[PDB]
Every structure is written in structure tokens, then in C-alpha cells.
């Protein structure tokens, strides 16, 4: 991603109706760490879900370790809870080469002064002055009155625990709906005039598959024999009708 939010203002985004290369950052090495929780580091493209989330934010390196589905920690319990009703993976890049500078980075205001914890998948941006003491602040800072969201002095010279990281979070959801997202699929090569154990879009059988003299509507995908035995397929990629002998 081009831009990231603070963790408090978690940049929540849902992904739907598409092919998601979930393992892309495992193989590309564009992030320093790729840690998965309930899903595999690789062969992640084999997971089909109804929806996935692909969120983005900037946190400290020690906080990167704290965020995980179902886990506790100051950042996990107060600024954003990542629930365990979902499976997921937390991936992070060292942003000393992007966000850090002398004077700090003011596009990342982290919540420090609170009365309560935020919920699973809950995003917020409030700037209301916080009362630490006994009297109302009414929008004015002072002893026992604080601005709730603040910038960190992230610099190229800080150690890893404090250095900022660009973190992207993958979260996998199942709800009472048809699934709309999965990873890419890989086809094997097509051989026609040989006995083959075939699988076309989930429909299987064993036979010799050659060009058919049948015609079909653009609509249709498979031909059928008695008791719905498949007797023809159209190839999913090649627009040819193939007869199953």
C-alpha cells in the first residue's frame, strides 16, 4: 500500500468478489516479517473464504509482535482488537526507509489517553480532550487534561522495538453467504486423445476427451447423458467443445 493509518484509526478494508494472492508477500520478501496464525505461511492461496480483510496501519516493532488474532497486549486490547473468529496473518515492513524522520511523523496519531478499550474491528479518530483528573477539561489541555492521539518521534536512529513498521493484516471470514474470494488456481496441461482422470470446474470422470461436433449457447458449460453423467465439457479457458468418450 501507498498509505497507512495509525493503529487507532485502523484502516479497515474488506476485499470481495476477486482473486487474492495471499502468499504474494511470503515470496516477494517486500516485508521483513510474515507471521501467520491458523493459516500457513505458504500455500495460503489454497484458502477460500467468503470475505477477507486487508487492513493497513503504522506501529512500533514491539507492537507488531503484540498484534495477532485472539491475542492480548497493550495495542491489541486497547486500540484494536483482532478477533479469533477469523483466521489471519500479520505482515510488516521496516518504515525507517519511508516514514521515519527527525521531528517525528504526524500522520500517525496513536491513542494514549483513554477511558476504555476499543472493540474487535473497531476504528476511531476522536480528538476530545481526556480527563485524567476530577474535573471536566471542556476542550482545554492542562495538568490532568490531555490530547488523546499523539505522534511518535520515529527516526532512522531508533532501535527495532521503537522503529515504526508498516503492517498489513490479513483476516479470513466465513458468514452465511456464497463465498466471493479465494487465491489463484493453477490448471494442468490439456491432453486430449489419451485416458485421463479429468476434473473440469469440480466435475469429474475418466475418459478420452476430443473435439466435439456439438453446439451450445454461450451460457452453457457442460453436456449431460442419462442420470446426469457428463458427456461433454467446454474448456474453461479454450472456447472449444470437447466430447468425453
Amino acid at each position: 500500500a501507498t498509505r497507512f493509518a495509525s493503529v487507532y484509526a485502523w484502516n479497515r478494508k474488506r476485499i470481495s468478489n476477486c482473486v487474492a494472492d495471499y502468499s504474494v508477500l511470503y515470496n516477494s520478501a517486500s516485508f521483513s516479517t510474515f507471521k501467520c496464525y491458523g493459516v500457513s505461511p505458504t500455500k495460503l492461496n489454497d484458502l477460500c473464504f467468503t470475505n477477507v480483510y486487508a487492513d493497513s496501519f503504522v506501529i512500533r516493532g514491539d507492537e507488531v509482535r503484540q498484534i495477532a488474532p485472539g491475542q492480548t497486549g497493550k495495542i491489541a486490547d486497547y486500540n484494536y482488537k483482532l478477533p479469533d473468529d477469523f483466521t489471519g496473518c500479520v505482515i510488516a515492513w521496516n518504515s525507517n526507509n519511508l516514514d521515519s524522520k527527525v521531528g517525528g511523523n504526524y500522520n500517525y496519531l496513536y491513542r494514549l489517553f483513554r477511558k476504555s478499550n476499543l472493540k474487535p474491528f473497531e476504528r476511531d479518530i476522536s480528538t476530545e480532550i481526556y480527563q485524567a483528573g476530577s474535573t471536566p477539561c471542556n476542550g482545554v489541555e492542562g495538568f490532568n487534561c490531555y490530547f488523546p492521539l499523539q505522534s511518535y518521534g520515529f527516526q532512522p536512529t531508533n532501535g527495532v522495538g521503537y522503529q515504526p513498521y508498516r503492517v498489513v493484516v490479513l483476516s479470513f471470514e466465513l458468514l452465511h453467504a456464497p463465498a466471493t474470494v479465494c487465491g489463484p488456481k493453477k490448471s494442468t496441461n490439456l491432453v486430449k486423445n489419451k485416458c485421463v482422470n479429468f476434473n473440469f470446474n469440480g466435475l469429474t470422470g475418466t475418459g478420452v476427451l476430443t473435439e466435439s461436433n456439438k453446439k451450445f449457447l454461450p451460457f452453457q458449460q457442460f453436456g449431460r447423458d442419462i442420470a446426469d453423467t457428463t458427456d461433454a465439457v467446454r474448456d474453461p479457458q479454450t472456447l472449444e467443445i470437447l466430447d468425453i468418450t
Partner: antibody
Framework: EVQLVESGGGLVQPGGSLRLSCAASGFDLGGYSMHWVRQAPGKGLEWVAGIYASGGATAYADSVKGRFTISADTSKNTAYLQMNSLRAEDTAVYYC?????????????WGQGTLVTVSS | DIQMTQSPSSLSASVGDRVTITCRASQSVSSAVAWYQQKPGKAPKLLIYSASDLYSGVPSRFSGSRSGTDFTLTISSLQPEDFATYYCQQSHTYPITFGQGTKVEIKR
């Protein structure tokens, strides 16, 4: 590296007073709160007072109200503590320390402190 | 006026051993407690801030976390330079309040 250096320590007669000061170097006072903490021999740390340099607002421990006053000067880049109506009980090393904003953050860097002792 | 309770008042362990010290506030102080080390003749040094964030200049051996309402400091492995009095400071709400200080001894 940042520095804080205490001075103005000394002796006070009972019922008397002493003014302490601390100079900052490597940073401004603006954006920071200057604090004074005392530690009597045999005791732990006791906070006395704090001032927000960019505010002018102050805060005090209940134990020192009516006796201690805190102030700061951003042109000189120094912090001050005025200690009045002192007792033998008030003997302590008085330290200056830095924290951010108006609090909610702990102190990071401390000066080393200067001794003030009260006797007839 | 929020008061501090610490435990143990003293701790004794050998070099390389694991040390845990806890601090409790009488009221909520959120996560704005800081830990300091003090050596005789010296001012306290910030060790850990905002409950669990390690301060630069402090070894990676130091860490900590909140459990229930209490905060725990952990030294994964004591080295000779880690023997000091350990203080907690609550800066969340004024007055800033410090605990007594936990003395950690080196086993001899």
C-alpha cells in the same frame, strides 16, 4: 544526549528558605514539563512540583502546598524551585527532571541533584 | 492523590537469574506507569515507560506487561549492572506519585 544540571544547593536556617535552579542543554524547555523531586536520606523519591514551559500552568504535591513554588524561564532555558518555611525534616537532595507535555508520560532524563540541609 | 504499593520490598538473585517485580496503583493510572533504576549517589534513570515501552539506552533484557490491574517488570537475565533500586512512577494523574523502591541484591 541531553543534559540537566542542578545548582544553588546550600544551608537553610529553620523557618528560612532556599531557591534552587537547573539548566537545560540539548533541548528547549518549550514542549516539556520541568519537574522537581526530592529525596531525603533513607527515603524514596517524592515529587514536589511541575511546570509546563509552554503553558505557565503548574501542579504540586499536596505535601508541599503552601511551602513550595515552581517556575521556569524559556529565554534562559532554566527551571526553578522556591522552597519556603523549611524544617530539618526537609533535608534532601533536590533533583530536576524532564517529562513531556503536561504528564501522562514518565520522566526520562534526570539531573543528578543538589543537597539542601536545614539547621539552626 | 493515587498511592503506590510495591512487592517484594527486596529481591535477591544471582547473575543470569530471572527477576520479577510488581507495582500497583490504588486507582486507575491506565498505562502511564514508568520504571526507574537508582544506584547510590545517582539520580534515577528511566528504564521502561508508558507501562511496557523500553527506553533507549536500556538493555533488551528488560521487558514487562500488565496482568489484571497490576504491572510486572521482568529482567530475563540479571547482569552486575542491573542491580539497583527499582522505582515505579505514576504520571497519569497528578500529583506524580512514586513508590518506595524495590531493592535488588546480587546473590553472594
Amino acid at each position: 544526549e541531553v543534559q540537566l544540571v542542578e545548582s544553588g544547593g546550600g544551608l537553610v536556617q529553620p523557618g528560612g528558605s532556599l531557591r534552587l535552579s537547573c539548566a537545560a542543554s540539548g533541548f528547549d524547555l518549550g514542549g516539556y514539563s520541568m519537574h522537581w523531586v526530592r529525596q531525603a536520606p533513607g527515603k524514596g523519591l517524592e515529587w514536589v512540583a511541575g511546570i509546563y514551559a509552554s503553558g505557565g500552568a503548574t501542579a504540586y504535591a499536596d505535601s508541599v502546598k503552601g511551602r513550595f513554588t515552581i517556575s521556569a524561564d524559556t529565554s534562559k532555558n532554566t527551571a526553578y524551585l522556591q522552597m519556603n518555611s523549611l524544617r530539618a525534616e526537609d533535608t534532601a537532595v533536590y533533583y530536576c527532571a524532564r517529562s513531556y507535555y503536561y504528564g501522562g508520560f514518565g520522566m526520562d532524563y534526570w539531573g543528578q541533584g543538589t543537597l539542601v540541609t536545614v539547621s539552626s | 492523590d493515587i498511592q503506590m504499593t510495591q512487592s517484594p520490598s527486596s529481591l535477591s538473585a544471582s547473575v543470569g537469574d530471572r527477576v520479577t517485580i510488581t507495582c500497583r496503583a490504588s486507582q486507575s493510572v491506565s498505562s502511564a506507569v514508568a520504571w526507574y533504576q537508582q544506584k547510590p549517589g545517582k539520580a534515577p534513570k528511566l528504564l521502561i515507560y508508558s507501562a511496557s515501552d523500553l527506553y533507549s539506552g536500556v538493555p533488551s533484557r528488560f521487558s514487562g506487561s500488565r496482568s489484571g490491574t497490576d504491572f510486572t517488570l521482568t529482567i530475563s537475565s540479571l547482569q552486575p549492572e542491573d542491580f539497583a533500586t527499582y522505582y515505579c512512577q505514576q504520571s497519569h494523574t497528578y500529583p506524580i506519585t512514586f513508590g518506595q523502591g524495590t531493592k535488588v541484591e546480587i546473590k553472594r
